[model samples]
Target chain A: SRRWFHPNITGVEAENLLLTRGVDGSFLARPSKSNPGDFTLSVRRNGAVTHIKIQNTGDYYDLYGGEKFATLAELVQYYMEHHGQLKEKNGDVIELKYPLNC
Target chain B: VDYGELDFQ
Candidate 1:
């Protein structure tokens, strides 16, 4: 069920999977392509693909500025279960409806 | 766990 955590996948490929086989809100998590030891989140929303950077500071995971989480899965789960929490800078809400299974 | 965003795209 946690197939969302894809191993060794690139950001380009992440967008492909989320947009091609997923409906709106479908998302996946993959290691960062540019930043090692970090992660990236790809989601399908507003008929477009959105990518959010997840910083792994060896202590917790955060959206670079919001709530902190000890685990990657917990962070993803928190946003999905809590509506109106994962918003963009301009208040554009990012929802999680389905997981992009491998 | 491997089983596993302010600048969102």
Candidate 2:
């Protein structure tokens, strides 16, 4: 499929991310990532939006006055579950790189 | 301080 150039998705939810076009033209994910740590994910459906916006949580990172973080998943998960400090110094990171191919 | 040297693999 590399020659086809389709994004490679793995893990359990790969089916939903790749096959399903989503209900509102968007995909929803809860993930096994309930723990607070740095993680990244790339997700998209075929023939939809060219790009995807990944929000670590429901809010903007810079507005919170924190350092730019590399792993949005872990940073956001920590904020959601414990309200603990993000490993990043001050909230500066907005868009983050997904840890794996999707 | 040894958690297997934190090897990802």
Candidate 3:
């Protein structure tokens, strides 16, 4: 949600986490300065209802995602922000299948 | 604009 709460993970962490959890998750993120939680993500598939929790690591998130990540890099996009990065042009959404881009 | 491939070729 907010820099006061969720500062590091951004909105990308949700989709990336869902993807890693083999849940065929696809969504887009919109960033905002006024409302950090203004970032909205829509998981386009069905597997399990995921409850996302956020915590702070002094300035960032100590842990991103839930029981849905296989590695740190899966959720940590330290270099870039994920906007419409996982759109249909990227690949056919599937579980455990690498998004054709990378 | 430089279309690099076409111009070079």
Candidate 4:
């Protein structure tokens, strides 16, 4: 099992998990609360948990505006490989370095 | 903003 994927954890559970067990850059993916079949990427960054949505559009997955991939793992793999600093539009940088393994 | 507005810890 991919330790990063927590299939049934809810949003607050995601926050609690990250804050209690993660260091900066540690992250995990969980089923999205607002969208069935979609996902949320929760990362420990800047001493807070940032939740990024992943859209599953029937055939592929995407970050809503950027590149698309066939699955959640590959989408995550791409970002983490980009020196995967999830940059906020106004200039916040989120580093994803390790999985907050279960 | 497509992100969740979670209360910070």
Relative to the unseen true structure, what is the C-alpha lDDT of residue A27 in candidate 1, on a scale of 0 to 100?
Answer: 88
Query: How does model 4 score on DockQ?
Result: 0.15
- TM-score of every candidate relative to the true structure: 0.87, 0.22, 0.23, 0.86
> What DockQ does each prediction reach against the true complex?
0.12, 0.02, 0.01, 0.15
lDDT of 1 by residue, A13-55 (tens): 8877777799998988888876899998888887788888888
Kindly report which residue pairs in candidate 3 clash with one another: none
Pairs in steric clash, model 2 = A37-A74, A40-A99, A66-A90, A66-A91, A67-A90, A67-A91, A67-A92, A68-A92, A68-A93
Please tell me what DockQ candidate 2 reaches: 0.02
Residue B9 C-alpha lDDT in model 1: 35
Ranking by DockQ: 4, 1, 2, 3
Top-scoring candidate (TM-score):
1
TM-score of chain B of 4: 0.29
Better of 1 and 2 by DockQ: 1
Name the regions of candidate 2 deviating beyond 4 angstroms. A1-10, A21-36, A47-67, A70-102, B1-9
Indicate whether candidate 3 or candidate 4 has the larger lDDT: 4
Which is the leading candidate under DockQ? 4
TM-score of 1: 0.87
| DockQ head-to-head 1 vs 4, winner | 4
TM match of model 3 to true structure = 0.23
Query: Which regions in candidate 4 have their CA more than 4 angstroms from the true location?
Result: B1-9
